Design a protein around this ligand. Structure first.
Ligand SMILES: [Zn+2]
Ligand SMILES: [Zn+2]
Ligand SMILES: [Zn+2]
Ligand SMILES: [Zn+2]
Lengths: 95, 10
């Protein structure tokens, strides 16, 4: 129930897995600027707004970008893949 | 946190 590729860079390898309920995301230590897996239960960066410390309420489905209500305006648009939201790093026609 | 080992691409 965790993905087989790093949500930040998209490649496989050694991945640390998110502990937040229902989150399947996993990441390279290097992509998290870490040397070892965090100690104990860990919450991945997807749940925090890109622009502040608030919890995210809207999410890019293609990378860890996500946004609180204060910062969500204009940040995400539907993509060709079932309408799943994507941030400005992706081509919505081929996310 | 737990880690796992998966295959690299390309
Ligand atoms: Zn990575
Ligand atoms: Zn997570
Ligand atoms: Zn915010
Ligand atoms: Zn994105």
């Amino acid at each position: 129930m965790h993905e087989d590729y790093c949500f930040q860079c998209g490649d496989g390898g050694e991945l640390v897995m998110c502990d937040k309920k229902d989150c399947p995301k996993a990441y390279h230590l290097l992509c998290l600027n870490l040397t070892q897996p965090p100690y104990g239960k860990w919450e991945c960066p997807w749940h925090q707004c890109d622009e502040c410390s608030s919890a995210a309420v809207s999410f890019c489905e293609f990378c860890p970008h996500s946004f609180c209500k204060d910062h969500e305006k204009g940040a995400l648009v539907p993509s060709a893949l079932e309408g799943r939201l994507c941030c400005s790093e992706h081509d919505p026609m081929a996310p | 946190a737990r880690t796992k080992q998966t295959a690299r691409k390309s």
